[PDB]
Amino acid sequence: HMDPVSVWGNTPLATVDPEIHDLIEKEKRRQCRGIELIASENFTSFAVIEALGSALTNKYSEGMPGNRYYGGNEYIDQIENLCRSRALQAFHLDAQSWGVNVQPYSGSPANFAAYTAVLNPHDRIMGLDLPSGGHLTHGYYTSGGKKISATSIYFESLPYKVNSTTGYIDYDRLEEKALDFRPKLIICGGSAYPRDWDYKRFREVADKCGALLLCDMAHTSGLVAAQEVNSPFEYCDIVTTTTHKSLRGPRAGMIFYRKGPKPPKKGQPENAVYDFEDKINFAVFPSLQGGPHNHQIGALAVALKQAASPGFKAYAKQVKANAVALGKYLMGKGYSLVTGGTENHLVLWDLRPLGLTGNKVEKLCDLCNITVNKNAVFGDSSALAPGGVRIGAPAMTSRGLVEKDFEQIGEFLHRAVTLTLEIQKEHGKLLKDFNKGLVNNKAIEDLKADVEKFSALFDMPGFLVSEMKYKD
Template sequence: METRRSSIRSWGNQTLRSVDPKLYGIIEKEKQGQINGIELFASENYVRRAVMEALGSHLTNKYSNGIPGARYYGGNQYIDYEKLEERALAFCPKLLICGGSVYPRELDYARFRQIADKCGAVLMCDMAQISGLVAAKKGCEPRGSEIVLYQGNDVKEYDFEERINFAVFPSLQGGPHNNHIAALAVALKQVATPEYKAYMQQVKKNAQAFVSALLGRNYYKLLTGGTDNHMVLWDLRSLGFSGDNLDLNFAN
């Protein structure tokens, strides 16, 4: 166990230069170009060192949902597939989305596929919360659901790509920040490594260990009774707490 932990820590602490020498070289070349040249684009004015430190700080690991003063992470409890099918057939949506922000169990993607086919909807899987596990092939893969481009066994292409691209640019996005693109490239390269798969495997084991520890105390209750992924929904109502109350107490 300790050997595995040490291996994962070592993998996670690698520098960009060792993980992706090619990208490191591109960034260094750009750095020298900025130092030795003159930038005439107003939108590419040089930021101060303090700004660069903030961009590369531990805030990279934080995410805010909602607006200031009204942060919220919504969750799902149980999915009623019969009710879902009933409503889908009643309203006939053009798009049916499966997935959720906080759901600790694997979804029945094949059932979602059947319901979408029945009502003539395109099925899209929102797997933002489980994408790390999916990439590592550690369960939770959205089998049976079609994502954006193809429909059923007919391999019928939807014409979504052009419309989605247009909705992003120029409709919603002016221009992406290149540091974000570079960081995503490095992250995706690391996802393809055996170390990442070991890391994700340990994440699931940690979640299971947490579940076992909580259920070992008879007065603790978990929604859905456990987890199939990395998320655990702890029902605090029997202890006289709400999620907001406990969050505030922990913060203090």
């Protein structure tokens, strides 16, 4: 005989699965008692999380609102229509000129569907090279020729790079490359580029070689919504994004695409209109995905409502101000930030002049409750032992930190990188040797203690710190 429904189906997680409950509680503590500096991370709201964790997960709704492959979607259709309208509203787009698909499971699924919509297999793409700051899905293959992203396997990639001495995109070399290589699609936006984008120039290059132009604004989408960085929609045909980075929503993707009359082009027929909508929609489903994750879509609708608030614009300005204040602190100590600063939410920090790799700094930081990620920098031949570390402001800004707080974060990072170098100098560069300095290191314990003291001063979205299992 079956269990009663209530026993398996209505009993709380803390009773059904104490192990997973306990680990989530440990993760909750970790999230609010360290300094979380991964530039792609945020702390989303409790309201988002309540939508995310809901009966919306139970629904199959393949297709489009009002034209589904399954019955029962009366309310799912309203949620998805609301999410789409809030997505357009959040970025101040007119529905006559822009549509959006909110079904991508994540950012990488959003980009692959966008590419599948407008490209045939082996069509040519160019995006920012990963060590220059571009994303995996922008066509990444290594300088040794190893195809890493499937966007370099199913499509033909030729990346463009930053200037090797300034760290800024070399728009002249971008243009010359696009004219030689003749891409069908040029991708802009990136994962570790600390400056804004001259989308107008990208449009000029795309028009000179007849390419489509797509912006992936995943990292800065919240800053775009808040009108705090350049808008890609003014110049790009398609804009993809994640929703969980600076937009501060659930993990999901969106694809924005132009609709309606095309701008005037020579030879182009009169009355020409954009043709993205049906192809984008079809590429997401049925080409690539299956059932939408409606709990993500519902949670995303919440997040887009929250991103369209006056409070969110001030958040986005604070993120930029915090990144700049951090950047100034680090550069004052002599740390090598790419481009010597930032115009967005992140800094990219070249550790090679110190004789360090990013994995060592990431590991030492981790032991002090400082959460970063190692990161490739220009000319790197390793991702797991790269020459850089990347620091972002969104997550801690979401806990309310301001510029002086991010100067203190800079001080903690200076202490952490100093300690990293000291350990390497005393114990050596090999990881087996370096790891010996990570044990019973009083300076690690001091820095960890200072970090948690600091972290505990601030509020925390998403859950009630007062109610967590693991207390101070």
